[PDB]
Amino acid sequence: SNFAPRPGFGTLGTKCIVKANHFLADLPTKDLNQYDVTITPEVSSKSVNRAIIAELVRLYKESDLGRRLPAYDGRKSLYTAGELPFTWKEFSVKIVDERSYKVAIKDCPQEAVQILDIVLRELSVKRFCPVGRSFFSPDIKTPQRLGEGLESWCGFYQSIRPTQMGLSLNIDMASAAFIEPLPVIEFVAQLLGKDVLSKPLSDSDRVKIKKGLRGVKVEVTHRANVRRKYRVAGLTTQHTHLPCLQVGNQKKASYLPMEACKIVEGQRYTKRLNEKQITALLKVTCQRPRDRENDILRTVQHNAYDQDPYAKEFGMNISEKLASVEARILPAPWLKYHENGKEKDCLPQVGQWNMMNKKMINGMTVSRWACVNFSRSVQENVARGFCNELGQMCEVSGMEFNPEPVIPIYSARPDQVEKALKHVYHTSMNKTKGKELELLLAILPDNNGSLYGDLKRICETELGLISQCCLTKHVFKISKQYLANVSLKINVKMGGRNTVLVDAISCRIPLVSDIPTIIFGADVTHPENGEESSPSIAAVVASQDWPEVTKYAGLVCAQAHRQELIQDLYKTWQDPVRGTVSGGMIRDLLISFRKATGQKPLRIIFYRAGVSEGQFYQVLLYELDAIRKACASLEPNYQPPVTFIVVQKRHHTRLFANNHRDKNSTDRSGNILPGTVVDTKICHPTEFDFYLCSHAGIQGTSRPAHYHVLWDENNFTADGIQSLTNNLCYTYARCTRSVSIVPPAYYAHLAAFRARFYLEVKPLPALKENVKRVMFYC
RNA sequence: UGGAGUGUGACAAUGGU
RNA sequence: CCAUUGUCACACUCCA
Ligand SMILES: [Mg+2]
């Protein structure tokens, strides 16, 4: 039917003013009429068809139409200011640069602003040039060259969206690099970086220049007045040392001097960017959020939708100022640490912190391990020193480490990885009278080349041993931060936890810490390798302790090729021995939660990540039906209130600060503070969703996460969801900062990306039991 | 593959005509 | 055709 409505706006948190990029567009719903084309031929060239329509209209702008400027999308459709008096016009206006075109002519906001978007694209095409959807214009921000002849301006790309303030036009900034409009002499001088007038060019250099100039339009300069432009037919094999240029038809071999041509501002694309060019473009493409806001503001002031014949003939209005919206800043939560450490409560300042004089909540006390060395550079002494230093860092960071390994560090070679792992596991099994190995510190080389894949495939699919890898350069140059951040992984990998929310411990967080609640997750990772052969694999994670929700336990399965839905939540196959057996992922995760806590969950919160607005409804229907069926098949009369929350990240809605000279910014990359929520004036007006940016920026802008709360049953308040999501966004296991998208929907993608190595329709090999209950993937 | 983030390229899924 | 999103790869920056 319909999604879950909005139960209001929040009030808690501080106040601040954020200026997003959503220019409100006063829609002119006076009158708009569509039309069509009755053409006997067919032209597939968008630009050519557009020129045709323009010329044909000019041929009869005032003769028959009358004081009108009709539009044209690019298909069988024309949009005017109304219904024109004529009904049976006949025109066969040809184009000369050649077939007769015989013709016989015969809810309020959506259609009107679809016409608005059509005329927007028409204006952009008429003024600037088109390129992969995004229009780019030179005279925007003083374009400058970044390479030999490649110079990059600042383009843009609009998209109307039916937001809350009345539908609004959107704007973003995209950059492309095109060749400079300079004489060929200077172009060659900059390309080769050497003297060219007195120094003859080599054959390889000549071939490179010919390839670079292939397809480049050139205008003759030997004529003062007739500077006709021609396409480059080729370069002749034979300052007279400069080879002649072939233009025109291949049969009509015309030779011109290299100095008798010029660049005609190339249209589509230049030669593929190199390493030295991509770095400069990256240095220029993304700037501080202040500069991003300035360019977004400028690209509409320059484009000037206000003063335009189309705007005059329709009345459409777009304010040249970015939208100003109020957006509360949620407060950071309190974190409880083990009492043995100097500090027991640390609050995150700007969304990040470090464990100075702090100790993890639970130390799993690893006492058996081995270190396998997959390299020739690092040797026994260096590997033993690295292991000892990691042990000392782990002991000072919270859990006891056995100072000496079970077996001496078994050096090996990359090719015999299976033999090395088998020997190490079996030797250490033989010793200690058969006690399983807690962890193995692999040390794999810099450019492993599937060694990492083979290692993390064997150690989990076949052996059942929790592993941990470190590159060679880190071993050679160890740092306290690096050792601490690997110690966090080692601690969470053994079923322990290291950070816990103070609110959850006290059982005070709303609608979560009063009855058993499990916070799920989901994601997919398509193969992008061939077609119909490599299955796309799906992952699901779920919490496994109610008083504090920090421990997850994921499990993965393969599914059909490039299917976005999580194919198998609840699958039933006939089994004559047992009957109509059930299974999937939901049954297994609920069973694991029940075993690991004691009480069946009584409220499911689900964080399905990565779906499109086009298929929100279909994915909601299928996943929620699967959840209901799975839970109903676990115990009769067991229907927990589910709460879908779809997470999106790749969205083109930025967020800046009202004044960029104040304390309303982070330490660096002075965009918004970590924790802002913007659920007013930029969102789906009738569906409950809210932007959010829980992660401190580092450079460039900060792409806020766009949570889109789908079907909701247990009646969360909007402030309740915002607070719970921001708070949950802090308890990240493998890091000490604040994550962008919440860990329940982060671990899913992380485990799905992990599971791609397990394969080598066609389900993946199962994970061993003793590496499933713990966070193997993280 | 210590981790977090934001730029680009390539490829891909889905909604309306 | 017009979009909304996703995966992968590379580059850069930052952490005690
Ligand atoms: Mg993902």
Numbering used by the authors: 126 to 222, 234 to 242, 262 to 393, 425 to 946, 971 to 988
Task: Quote from the publication.
A loop in the AtAGO10 central cleft is essential for recognizing specific mismatches opposite the guide strand 3′ region in miR166/165 duplexes. Replacing this loop with the equivalent loop from Homo sapiens AGO2 (HsAGO2) changes AtAGO10 miRNA loading behavior such that 3′ region mismatches are ignored and mismatches opposite the guide 5′ end instead drive loading, as in HsAGO2. Mismatches at positions 12 and 13 of the miR166 diplex are important for miR166 recognition by AtAGO10 in vivo. Examining the AtAGO10 structure, we identified five loops in the central cleft (first loop: residues 287–288, second loop: residues 714–720, third loop: residues 747–751, fourth loop: residues 796–800, fifth loop: residues 835–840) that are located near miRNA duplex base pairs involving guide strand nucleotides 12 and 13. Thus, we hypothesized that one or more of these loops may participate in the recognition of the 12–13 mismatches. Aligning the primary sequences of HsAGO2 and AtAGO10 revealed that the second central loop is divergent, while the other four loops are highly conserved. Thus, we suspected that the second loop might be responsible for the difference in duplex selectivity between AtAGO10 and HsAGO2. We tested this hypothesis by replacing the second central loop in AtAGO10 (residues 714–720) with the sequence of the corresponding loop in HsAGO2, and expressing and purifying the resulting AtAGO10 mutant protein (AtAGO10-714-720-Hs). Thus, the second central loop plays an essential role in establishing the specialized duplex selectivity of AtAGO10, possibly through direct recognition of the mismatched 12–13 region of miR166/165 duplexes. We therefore reason that, in addition to opening the AtAGO10 central cleft to enable duplex loading, the chaperon system also positions the central loop for recognition of the miRNA duplex near the guide 3′ region.
The loading of sRNA duplexes into the proper ARGONAUTE (AGO) protein is a key step to forming a functional silencing complex. AGO proteins are composed of N-terminal (N), Linker-1 (L1), PAZ, Linker-2 (L2), MID and PIWI domains to form a bilobed structure with a cleft in the center to retain the sRNA. Arabidopsis thaliana expresses two AGO proteins, AtAGO7 and AtAGO10, that display remarkably exclusive sRNA loading preferences, with each largely dedicated to one or two specific sRNAs. Thus, a major, albeit noncanonical function of AtAGO10 is to bind miR165/166 and promote its degradation, thereby limiting the loading of miR165/166 into AtAGO1 and elevating the expression levels of miR165/166 targeted genes that are important to maintaining the stemness of the SAM.
